[PDB]
Write a protein that binds this ligand. Structure first.
Ligand SMILES: Cc1ccc(CN2CCS(=O)(=O)CC2)cc1
Ligand SMILES: Cc1ccc(CN2CCS(=O)(=O)CC2)cc1
Ligand SMILES: Cc1ccc(CN2CCS(=O)(=O)CC2)cc1
Ligand SMILES: Cc1ccc(CN2CCS(=O)(=O)CC2)cc1
Ligand SMILES: Cc1ccc(CN2CCS(=O)(=O)CC2)cc1
Ligand SMILES: Cc1ccc(CN2CCS(=O)(=O)CC2)cc1
Ligand SMILES: [Zn+2]
Ligand SMILES: [Zn+2]
Ligand SMILES: [Zn+2]
Ligand SMILES: [Zn+2]
Lengths: 360, 360
């Protein structure tokens, strides 16, 4: 069976299981089940499934080099699909809540879930809670007797928690740290002293790399019983590196990809986000450029947003991006090679993850 | 040591552990740690700790009848405190998010967390996520090698999930089921056909009884290694019964307790909630009363809210409440007795839980 149709089939299976259980154990009525069905589909489906399919691809890599009965191949692949959906539904939780937190309008060319007329914020906050609760119910049902249950649940939680800490670092990235205070409304920084490469790398490490790259790779190892084919410090290092590059790309696209292809109107400028473009621009600007940036950034006024975009274009950030890209290519290739000391197979899955990111 | 000072001490311990770990493992800076500290205190502290202290009291009950080394008594009590905080922090998650979902102003005579000036909804949604993530980090740290870890984590998840399903039943309780539809803005029911005792009991069972009464009782059994001193179907039955009574009391207080003592201005009428008062009123009203209720319920207009309160007062709902209370007293005493077949001790803890609820 091809991997993607397997993965999509298991979605239907898992959906049916969740909804059936709601009717048999939680007293749900058919109409609320239908609401939840539609919510699940709307929030979990229509992406590329990169994350969840990475679990499947890592497991397929090991299957090719490990002896197993056919029934065991099938079980491993089924477990990789269930694990992949756990990550997809965890992402769906994040996207639902982040869209509400940010006041976002669109995502992938459709309205954010909370904006649907019969949803509203009141229900959407809790729908997003249910999305993450479903990752747990999947795990406890499908993995009940698996030797990797403990390790998978402990990994998932730590990744979830890193991700929420990353969200805190992102939402507070334009405040001055020393002014953070629940009692006092938070002003935008005026110095931008915290718009540094290291502070940027911390936001991105936590907010996206743990759930986007570390979790799918490590979940593929766990369902394969293969965590001894790797040196875990290398897997962390490479996940955090590729993940950062991925986010740099998104940051650049927020500013410069047309909204039709981007799937939304990018607002990182208006939102005063600590983006790669802002940090890179500040890292090369002269005094007059810095002052122009300060006078215009973090404002809704379209004229001011256009002043920032013009500053970025004139500053030749494409060159800084090429230099960054080159360095990432170097270090990701060095880590892949270190990963072959223990598993050629795992190293190749990491190569493929790299190729999908670099050349999307 | 007295139980409550033990419990409060462990709060300080757990807080220090969480914040220390954020600095050693998650790259947090001192100012963000302070924000999180203040968030934790603000959202977790200042209640009665009923839930968390019930775990401690169940464990203290068993300790009095079971032989153990002193160091084991201490470990069991420490584990009961950590488990109790897991429930308190899970409640804090619920209250933070519910206050945002409902647009609430106050809770326990102070502003809702999201209303604090330096918080805002954007940060508060994620603070509430972190609250629940912390229940997991507590568990994996303090219970890493405990024989009850699996059972405790599986119980916690199912309780969390029931609670979120209960929130869905609550937020949708004034819609007609057959009209639920993400695509269509939801009208208030005009027939109130779904304001029944059974539908009410389903909302309340899920939204509060699993986390308020079942989880503390069962967590006390788990940290005591005492789940064989009970018949679990009886523990469920009694938890769901006491929990329902608790919520009926809250529903009555929302309408009739002065806001100063209630800790907030009650809005269940304006919010069109399926409250015990509404369901009981509809269960005895004549046609003219029903029509007056329909014309006034679920409106912000204070004059209309006063018309509903007047209908309730004239309908002698205090008598229906006394009749309900009497019946609950009967059934809770019958269940306590059934609980003595296997554990006098556990039955007495349930008696105390009952006494704290009935006579608060
Ligand atoms: C010990 C060992 C022997 C052979 C192989 C290759 N193998 C072919 C048959 S299979 O269906 O098991 C898929 C992988 C790997 C390991
Ligand atoms: C409450 C909450 C916690 C974490 C996240 C992380 N999220 C990942 C996806 S992202 O980078 O698109 C937007 C941030 C979101 C919400
Ligand atoms: C810093 C920088 C890097 C690259 C580009 C070019 N850009 C790449 C792909 S895109 O969809 O973002 C639109 C075109 C511009 C600026
Ligand atoms: C087998 C058994 C013997 C005695 C007891 C009572 N016991 C007193 C001493 S203690 O500190 O262990 C607390 C409970 C219970 C069980
Ligand atoms: C997102 C979410 C899920 C569940 C709850 C349950 N909560 C219990 C406490 S309550 O009855 O006060 C208000 C409802 C809240 C929020
Ligand atoms: C249905 C019903 C029951 C009891 C009461 C009396 N009430 C009890 C406590 S209270 O703080 O809600 C205010 C006074 C009135 C109506
Ligand atoms: Zn965001
Ligand atoms: Zn972005
Ligand atoms: Zn609510
Ligand atoms: Zn209430």
């Amino acid at each position: 069976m091809a991997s993607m149709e397997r993965f999509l089939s298991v979605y239907d299976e898992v959906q049916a299981f969740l909804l059936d259980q709601l009717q048999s154990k939680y007293e749900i009525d058919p109409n609320r089940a239908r609401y939840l069905r539609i919510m699940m589909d709307t929030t979990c489906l229509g992406g590329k499934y990169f994350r969840g399919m990475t679990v499947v691809n890592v497991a397929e890599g090991f299957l090719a080099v490990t002896q197993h009965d056919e029934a065991t191949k099938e079980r491993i692949l089924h477990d990789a699909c269930v694990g992949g959906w756990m990550i997809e539904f965890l992402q769906a939780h994040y996207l639902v809540e982040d869209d509400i937190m940010d006041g976002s309008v669109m995502r992938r060319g459709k309205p954010c879930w909370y904006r649907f007329p019969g949803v509203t914020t009141q229900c959407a906050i809790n729908d997003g809670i249910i999305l993450k609760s479903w990752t747990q119910i999947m795990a406890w049902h499908y993995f009940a007797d698996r030797p990797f249950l403990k390790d998978l649940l402990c990994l998932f939680q730590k990744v979830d928690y890193a991700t929420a800490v990353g969200q805190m670092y992102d939402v507070t990235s334009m405040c001055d740290s020393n002014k953070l205070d629940p009692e006092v409304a938070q002003p935008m920084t005026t110095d931008f002293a915290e718009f540094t490469p290291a502070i940027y790398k911390r936001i991105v490490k936590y907010k996206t790399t743990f759930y986007t790259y570390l979790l799918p790779l490590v979940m593929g190892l766990l369902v394969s019983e293969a965590a001894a084919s790797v040196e875990m410090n290398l897997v962390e290092r490479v996940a955090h590196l590729i993940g950062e590059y991925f986010q740099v790309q998104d940051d650049v696209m927020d500013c410069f990809t047309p909204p039709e292809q981007l799937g939304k109107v990018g607002t990182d400028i208006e939102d005063a986000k600590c983006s790669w473009l802002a940090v890179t621009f500040l890292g090369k600007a002269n005094a007059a450029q810095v002052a122009e940036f300060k006078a215009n950034y973090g404002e809704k006024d379209p004229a001011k947003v256009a002043v920032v975009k013009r500053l970025y274009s004139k500053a030749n950030l494409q060159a800084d991006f090429a230099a960054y890209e080159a360095e990432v290519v170097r270090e990701v290739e060095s880590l892949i090679e270190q990963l072959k000391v223990k598993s050629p197979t795992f190293a190749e899955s990491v190569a493929v993850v790299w190729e999908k990111t670099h050349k999307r």
